[PDB]
């Protein structure tokens, strides 16, 4: 066989999704044109990547790419897995490349889908707030994530979802008070400290 | 606004007809969208 060191099959397909994306007016229009293509299930992970990268060329968040992605998820469940695989793939791998102007786009992007339950709160369990397993640009991404959570839902509605989330990544309770001192310090730096009332009760008992 | 989108269609196609009136043929196949929308640096009209 002749070895394939180039991906010209992918580049032509990557061009076609980008042309679809730029030829539409509304978010429902581009959502129609992507679902018209009947993309095979192996490429539906890659199509989500093309949407997100072209959402970073915009230099500002747009509600286009949200309502584009919302009509994907409600159509068929393999789209919904494709965003759930991408959100892990973005946070665990792609944060090291992205500038801070691109992180405010993504934190507002994924914060829109999480706050309207297109992604569950359980996808936030992957994200963990330590000193070791955090990026400085990863802390920027979380900060722009929670602001879109605060702005859409409100501070009390966010409090209810984080209590039903039962996650450990943002919320250490079982011990390791250096992480509890870390997590109170990080959330108050964002501007949200009303949710940290659980940790301060846990911290002074350790003292 | 739905009515504005209709005026954008009817408006842009009148401009394309003005070129198609300039040449003596209003035919569709004679004027592929490459004619109107190619930028001026390549010889097209540069229509947006």
């Amino acid at each position: 066989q002749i070895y394939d060191m180039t991906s010209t099959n992918d580049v032509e397909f990557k061009k076609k999704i980008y042309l679809v994306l730029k030829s539409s007016l509304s978010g429902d229009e581009a959502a129609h044109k992507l679902l018209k293509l009947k993309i095979a299930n192996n490429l539906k992970k890659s199509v989500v990547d093309i949407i997100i990268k072209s959402s970073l060329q915009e230099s500002t968040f747009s509600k286009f790419y949200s309502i584009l992605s919302e009509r994907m998820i409600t159509f068929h469940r393999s789209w919904q897995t494709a965003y759930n695989e991408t959100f892990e793939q973005n946070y665990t791998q792609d944060i090291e490349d992205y500038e801070t102007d691109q992180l405010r786009i993504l934190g507002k992007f994924w914060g829109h889908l999480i706050s309207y339950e297109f992604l569950p709160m359980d996808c936030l369990k992957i994200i963990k707030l330590t000193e070791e397993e955090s990026c400085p640009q990863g802390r920027i991404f979380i900060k722009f994530l929670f602001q879109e959570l605060v702005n859409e839902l409100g501070l009390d509605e966010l409090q209810l979802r984080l209590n039903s989330s039962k996650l450990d990544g943002m919320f250490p309770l079982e011990g390791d008070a250096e992480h509890i001192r870390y997590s109170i310090n990080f959330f108050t730096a964002i501007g949200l400290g009303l949710l940290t009332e659980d940790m301060r009760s846990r911290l002074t008992i350790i003292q | 606004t739905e009515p504005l989108l209709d005026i954008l269609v009817k408006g842009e196609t009148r401009i394309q007809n003005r070129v198609k009136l300039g040449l003596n043929s209003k035919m569709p196949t004679r004027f592929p969208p490459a004619v109107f929308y190619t930028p001026k640096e390549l010889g097209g009209l540069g229509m947006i």
Partner: peptide, 27 residues
């Protein structure tokens, strides 16, 4: 079929009048 959606005619529309269902809006 023409279910109340579309144009009275494609004559003065300057379009083809081609109507396709939004695959995005289902639920």
């Amino acid at each position: 079929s023409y279910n109340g959606i579309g144009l009275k005619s494609a004559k003065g529309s300057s379009t083809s009048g081609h109507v396709q269902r939004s695959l995005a809006s289902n639920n």
